[PDB]
Amino acid sequence: SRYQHTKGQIKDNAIEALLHDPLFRQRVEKNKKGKGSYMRKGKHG
């Protein structure tokens, strides 16, 4: 199925417009433990 992208009416490049689109934003994950790992309640209980 289709994808409703950000950049309305992409002209030239058909692949370097989507690279800035939030489909290809940088997925950064969370640490544990690690500079930024506070729980407050974890996955269970």
């Binding site: 289709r2 994808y3 409703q4």
Partner: protein
């Protein structure tokens, strides 16, 4: 406070508006469904969520989420719309009833198949 001040302007009841403007308290609405697509969610989730815009039969033009795995909608495919936001996509306040008027049930559910519109398997 001050019971004399409640005689001039009475203690006015707070009005709460409806989350789903689906035309005045009806459970489902049938929709004409132009423009089926996918959209990326808001910040923490990062999936590719399937969602269709829908021309409702009264005049409203709403977008509506399509639950379940795999669908057969295409660019008209007149379907049925129930309420309920998805909290994850911006502007989506509805779901589609899987198993109603064009939107077939999910392939090979075994658990929780009233939702997602799948008949009980004969075998």
């Amino acid at each position: 406070a001050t019971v004399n001040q409640l005689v001039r302007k009475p203690r006015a009841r707070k009005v709460a508006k409806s989350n789903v403007p689906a035309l005045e308290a009806c459970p489902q609405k049938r929709g004409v469904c132009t423009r089926v697509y996918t959209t990326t969610p808001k910040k923490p989730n990062s999936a590719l969520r399937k969602v269709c815009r829908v021309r409702l039969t009264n005049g409203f033009e709403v977008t509506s989420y399509i639950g379940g795995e795999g669908h057969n909608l295409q660019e008209h495919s007149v379907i049925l719309i129930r309420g309920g936001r998805v909290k994850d996509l911006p502007g989506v306040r509805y779901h589609t009833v899987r198993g109603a008027l064009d939107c077939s049930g999910v392939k090979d559910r075994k658990q929780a198949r009233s939702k997602y519109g799948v008949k009980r398997p004969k075998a």
